[PDB]
């Protein structure tokens, strides 16, 4: 048993707050905000060794990462912006901070009761995503 046992699995997203003033606070333009705010992304996370790989998968984009705790990969956002990531645990919290053109934007994943919630935080905004089991 180890790092991220409870994230683990397969999550279908049940709510979501804020996000299109988050996407405007990041950047996002009109059309794929529109479009993104739609999606209801399942979020498939897995682990293998000390490889974590989280999947996004909606009707408007598949996306895939795949990274070692505290190690920077270059990432490719459903929005097509190209950053530059680094994901750690602090505290049994997933912290996920993508960094590009002198930008950053931080997302928190965690655990709380039977639900995954995702904080999306762009300078003072934030949008709270909640995710349950498939
Ligand atoms: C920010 C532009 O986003 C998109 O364009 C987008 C399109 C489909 S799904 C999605 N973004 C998300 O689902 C996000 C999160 C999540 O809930 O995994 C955490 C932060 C983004």
């Not at 996000?19 to 992304?41: I, L, N, Q």
Request: aromatic residues 8%; neutral net charge; charged residues 30%.
């Amino acid at each position: 048993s180890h790092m991220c046992d409870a994230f683990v699995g397969t999550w279908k997203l049940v709510s979501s707050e804020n996000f299109d003033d988050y996407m405007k606070e990041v950047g996002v333009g009109f059309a794929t905000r529109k479009v993104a705010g739609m999606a209801k992304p399942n979020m498939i996370i897995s682990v293998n060794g000390d490889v974590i790989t989280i999947k996004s998968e909606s009707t408007f984009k598949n996306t895939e990462i795949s990274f070692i705790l505290g190690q920077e990969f270059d990432e490719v956002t459903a929005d097509d912006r190209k950053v530059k990531s680094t994901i750690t645990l602090d505290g049994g919290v997933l912290v996920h901070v993508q960094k590009w053109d002198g930008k950053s934007t931080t997302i928190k994943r965690k655990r709380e009761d039977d639900k995954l919630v995702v904080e999306c935080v762009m300078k003072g905004v934030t949008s709270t995503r909640v995710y349950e089991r498939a």
